[PDB]
Design a protein around this ligand. Structure first.
Ligand SMILES: [Cl-]
Ligand SMILES: [Cl-]
Ligand SMILES: [Cl-]
Ligand SMILES: [Cl-]
Ligand SMILES: [Cl-]
Ligand SMILES: [Cl-]
Ligand SMILES: [Cl-]
Ligand SMILES: [Cl-]
Ligand SMILES: [Cl-]
Ligand SMILES: [Cl-]
Ligand SMILES: [Mn+2]
Ligand SMILES: [Mn+2]
Ligand SMILES: [Mn+2]
Ligand SMILES: [Mn+2]
Ligand SMILES: [Mn+2]
Ligand SMILES: [Mn+2]
Ligand SMILES: [Mn+2]
Ligand SMILES: [Mn+2]
Ligand SMILES: [Mn+2]
Ligand SMILES: [Mn+2]
Ligand code: NA
Ligand code: NA
Ligand code: NA
Ligand code: NA
Ligand code: NA
Lengths: 377, 377, 377, 377, 377
């Protein structure tokens, strides 16, 4: 039950003190496929290996370019809110995309024309807040836990502007002049940020809707991803949300992938941009093919972030007994992939045979229809 | 009448030789608000602190990233022309935006389809010359003084291509072949650039219009900013020109702001890009809130450049007895701001109260209409 | 037995699928000290989270700037050799430092004057190979497992030049001319690299010494670290090797630290350069103080790499029941530290009291002698 | 009395609102020499244009690469302390050099061998604290005001580690273990930094000297610059301190220059590194010659920072009625200059004549002795 | 006689218009060795492919990082002077090293203590001018042509400060004050640089020596390379000059290599830094081995610059009927190489046999003495 880095006549037993628990989580890294080769950047990081900021009302932990340097364009926060607790009104330079994993929450956003959008989001729903637009989150009666993705990997403390922090660092006489009140009237303003704070549960959504002289926002900032019809194939399902259906989501394209036991996200690549991954549940392995005979295999499980640099070939195999559920995230205005199977199926069979040194028995199995998740025979 | 860096029981008298004239211009820097905190980049530079290039016909001085390093994307020239004097036919890699502060001038531009645009510009008018399109300026009978803004902060001698400089560094036999003339016919070409040169006043605009086989340009390269209806609020006026109304101005969005004595440009931020400022007249202070409890206050007066990095919160207060007039410049295709007041006004009042630890007496003063310049009570 | 990110009235239970095994390894990251604050880069990475290259004869895995981006100046390989197995003759652009954790090995090196050094290294011994000098490793009868440290964090496949790889990519006619032999005489050269390969155990060291016309090397390339007298203090021992005693080790300074249960490497910083850490055995926590009120705590155990950026304050506490053993590595020609205790002990007591708002009862405990590892009372 | 940017038939009157006070301070920038040409970076910045941090006990303001981007390698703080006030025990990644302009202070420093140095510094004295060594400043009965120079232009809040800040962000149980005390015994530690704080005047220096088991420091960390014999020439004096006489000052070389009215620091350049300048008193102009026909003239007065990039030719002329006093600072282990006069004096006269198209009447005035400050005839 | 890119059954005839003259110069690039592989940067550039600056008195052309981007640290000028012509008094930020290929010249230099050095240099002699020290060159009765090497690859117009250019961009009143003369006395100064200018031949060297009050320079700035005893081996000679024998040459190490027909500079690498090459005469090929199975072969002839990045393996084979003469240049304080032959000769023979899969017949030919240039059998 003690694994060793041995493959046939290659490798040897570990002779120094070691981390057996981590080795058991990484079987394809302690003993990689013999087809791996060459230097490839790290493509895997666990939220469990990050500092958790604890507050009255919840917590937040992040995986950024300071943890996973291959991911320069995207960063992520795992945030948790207790029932009624508020993530303080704030904004960022980055656009923010979110997936609700557990529970439910009410969000607010106001746009640059002064129009307000207030909505409740449940498990499987998304939101997207464009760069610089101010927003808040308040958990409902079950609390909430969700994944935030920001479209800059350097996301840091310097990215986020909190309402009470701004006011605490503005001269009181200027605040008073701004609103037409006296300094005495604003003397009870907080002296520092709140960030996350406890609060009574709100009332019904309909009671919170604020009417305004500038009308309704043209497009909603939330999306019910799991209410859409997925792409179904023999081994699982894919739900896609990008700017073509979730109209406001102009800089983030996303897919939720479910892979049954014994199934795999097929060999494919993305012709548009890098892939950022979050593993919601289950256990996987992925080989990233990096060109020029370079390839490296990684293991993932719940709580891990993954990455596939622009156009590298890859697959995602379920290596456990439970369903594998993960997100594919892209900094682009649409989702796009090329399927290895479909590519070859759409070429003259003798041309494919000339490449692969295989016969009609192989080209006969190719499918001109794309099946993103396939089931083992 | 000698100011000292003392605020209550903090600070002390200056004991070394000092610049009292500059200290008097910078009262909120010698004695900042107690709400300032932390390292913030310099956001202020005076044209009076720059080298002035003097020529027969006028002068030019510039504030670039070599003077104000926070402004990497935008640079500016203050240029002056005597009556009739010509800024030599030239082009740049950068797009050029201009505001006519004093006097009037005739501009020419030819586009990449060979279409010509010639127009007169007066006080309060703009022009915008897209990258690489060749142009000239000639002052009319009052002379002219104007502000140029270029959409690269590294604007330098290497950005600008002058007609006579190009010809002076082209083999004479090639020039002759290009035009179908002899070398003798071009022997009087200048041996070096002119840049700015004296000239007789031109005739009437209508006599200068050149008709061509390629027709008129589809959109004009000048704009009468001060002839537009401004946004009026209790303390001043805002005139906006961006690509939605000044159609050719695709990379520069602008606003001219006037703030009466006792008034202020309200607390706001820009959700799209950095703000570059030029102070035409009057005296101001601005606090820039940089997130994570960082804030710094700056003083400005006529001839100063200011800056607000992308999405930082700010206000601009008139601290003098005369109107304050300044420009807000953005490298983007539209102007956008979020008002702190309007943001909070469009949220449920009890939610705002929970954030600010203030009551209904405060939320009752919030306005759902945006008022960019407010008047002190 | 299921840990939760809860500290008093802060934090909450985890509601999404999670990595409980990693959470148990990182108790001070799931529940940090309340004294932590602010954004700090990741300072921790496990060799168990890396791809292991398996060969006939052993294995090698690496932690580089592609895994741990804060460590730009230093990278490391964990290498294992079976009895008699050879790490092929090679050289690198980087200098190489090594610590023998398990077993023993014979090394060779030849310098730029053609002088050879051949020696056996056992547990607790070091070697240092200057940049560009060619070397080899061959394990003896117990095999060997050791830590290599290279003085560039970007250490990659492109850093290392193998004997047989060079020859395989040199025209055969040039090799033949170089050595004065025929192409037929070199026809059996390998067609690709070996890297690590199995081999019979060598004979006695004395039989391998090669005499040469250029004499002996002036300084040895191996060092018996654990044969030196350590600095002993109440809670452990420190063995230092830098260029002042291990003369050739000009770019790497090192210390082996042992910390008994209930003891800690005291609060200190390094005034010369960054610290790179490898945890040989045991379990630790460290808080890195990053200035300006920023601090973050990390957990470490056997197989982990740590890091402390230049001059940040830190301590290393044993949080387990077994001894804690780790290496402190520095890219410099000497080891240097400043002790917080010794610093304060060497100042006037009333001056220290004025800083700390503590009395003579505190300054009486300060020690003017440096004790690098202290024991809890 | 209103200056205009007019030189003969070049330039014109200013027609827009302007800063006449700054124009009067910058006569050679409003009206440059006709020999100036081309793009040259800004080489001038005033401490009066910076934010002043006010505390109980004094103030501090800084000029860094964020203000003066040409100065990437050096930054400076103007710091003021009231009588008895303390600049809190701290250290930096950067080396620190200082010149005492007004008053006097006591400094402490402890080195990496635990040796203490405590000394009083008066007007005209220097100190130098090597990178990472911890130190403090306490003003004596006159207070103190001084110039600090740090050998990295990016000097920021993140450069400096304060004693009480470190302790406030260290777990109390770790502090207690570090010193062998209880948590109750350290319960009164400050919760945040002090930075600068008021304190009673100290006793006599001799009473503060702390004896230690590690002996005295080998070289002193203070230097009496104005007690040295200066280089005297017809128009002023130069006092040099570099690592050849102020032995510890390995990364900063300095000169204090005094220039009488009607005198000038002669035409020269530095063959080793960039020059950073601080103007203590008086009024100057300097032309920087940047090669390839580029040159720009700058004005300076008390409180200004100047700069001369590596090897650019320059002079510093007194343009006022009082003595001109300034510092020349270099990030190097020695001071070096080449004098234009001495250079030409040491060449064959007919060779110099062939270059300059001048005769023996000119070469007869050249001097083979270097005179750094010359007096007008 | 028309070469084609065909090697056995690989390659094909060229079907498009082509440069047959260049193909004939590059036989090992049109048809590389089959042992070449992979992407390798360009390592070859011809002075004949550069712009030649022509002046009255000579010419100058350069190969810099703008031509050969792999060479970031070193750049070179081929300069020619007619009899008596002068390269104008000047200095640079870079150190300058030179090899006299044709003719002879007189150089001057003055150091930072005002000491002068004047000397004549002939064919095969060197000079080295440290950074920032001012110098001149004047050809004697045969004229001169020489190679300059500067220790920054970005060497450009902005690197060099000319005497008359500096004076032309300094206010006349400042020049007059600097020297104690009137403006009328300097009215005939040149209005622009000379750079290279014609002049009468100088007198005898002894008549030019300028005596000074500061004594003689401690070390000479010229070196007679070809008067030294070379390393001789069967196929050629190597003359080395670095800071250990040419004492002032602290940043440039050099070797002049002569390779007879049928000989080769042996397989070796440099453990210290990059190699920069200039081919004085003859024809060569070199394969650069770049690690990880990458290698590329280049052709060189008179007038070419070559390069070998730090530690890459290489050889230089004479592929013509005349001697091959080239320079090896290094930015370091010493020359160092490792010989492949000597390396293997200094190891146990059975250990080498185990690596190469060759027998005693091969290890018997290895030599423990280094022979830098070997002759084919
Ligand atoms: Cl206030
Ligand atoms: Cl409402
Ligand atoms: Cl011509
Ligand atoms: Cl016409
Ligand atoms: Cl061959
Ligand atoms: Cl032997
Ligand atoms: Cl505690
Ligand atoms: Cl004591
Ligand atoms: Cl003059
Ligand atoms: Cl003489
Ligand atoms: Mn957010
Ligand atoms: Mn994918
Ligand atoms: Mn223009
Ligand atoms: Mn604004
Ligand atoms: Mn090695
Ligand atoms: Mn340490
Ligand atoms: Mn300090
Ligand atoms: Mn100087
Ligand atoms: Mn030169
Ligand atoms: Mn070589
Ligand atoms: Na990073
Ligand atoms: Na800059
Ligand atoms: Na990296
Ligand atoms: Na800067
Ligand atoms: Na280049």
């Amino acid at each position: 039950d003690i694994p060793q880095p041995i493959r046939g006549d290659k490798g040897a037993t570990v002779k120094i003190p070691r981390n057996i628990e981590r080795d058991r989580q990484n079987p394809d890294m302690l003993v990689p496929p013999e087809t791996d080769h060459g230097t490839v950047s790290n493509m895997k990081f666990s939220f469990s290996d990050t500092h958790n900021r604890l507050e009255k009302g919840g917590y937040a932990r992040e995986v950024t370019v300071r943890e996973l340097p291959i991911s320069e364009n995207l960063a992520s926060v795992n945030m948790r809110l207790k029932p009624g607790a508020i993530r303080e009104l704030h904004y960022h330079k980055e656009a923010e995309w979110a997936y609700m994993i557990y529970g439910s929450a009410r969000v607010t956003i106001v746009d640059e024309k002064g129009r307000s959008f207030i909505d409740d989001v449940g498990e499987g729903d998304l939101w997207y807040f464009p760069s610089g637009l101010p927003h808040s989150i308040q958990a409902l009666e079950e609390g909430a836990e969700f994944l935030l993705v920001f479209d800059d990997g350097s996301f840091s403390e310097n990215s986020t502007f909190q309402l009470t922090d701004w006011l605490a660092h503005t001269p009181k006489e200027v605040i008073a002049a701004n609103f037409g009140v006296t300094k005495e009237e604003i003397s009870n303003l907080p002296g520092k940020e709140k960030y996350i704070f406890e609060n009574q549960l709100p009332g019904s959504l309909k009671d919170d809707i604020v009417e305004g002289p500038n009308g309704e926002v043209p497009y909603p900032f939330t999306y019910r991803l799991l209410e859409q019809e997925p792409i179904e194939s023999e081994g699982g399902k894919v739900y896609i949300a990008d700017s073509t259906n979730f109209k406001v989501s102009k800089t983030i394209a996303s897919a939720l992938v479910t892979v049954e036991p014994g199934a795999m996200r097929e060999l494919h690549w993305h012709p548009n941009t890098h892939e950022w991954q979050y593993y919601i549940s289950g256990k996987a392995r992925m080989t990233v093919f990096a060109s020029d005979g370079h390839a490296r295999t990684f293991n993932y499980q719940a709580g891990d972030v993954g990455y596939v640099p622009f156009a590298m070939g890859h697959y995602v195999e379920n290596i456990g007994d439970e369903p594998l559920v993960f997100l594919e995230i892209f900094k682009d205005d649409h989702y796009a992939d090329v399927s290895l199977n479909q590519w070859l199926a759409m070429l003259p069979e003798t041309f494919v045979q000339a490449h692969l040194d295989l016969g009609k028995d192989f080209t006969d199995v190719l499918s001109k229809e794309k099946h993103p998740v396939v089931k083992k025979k």
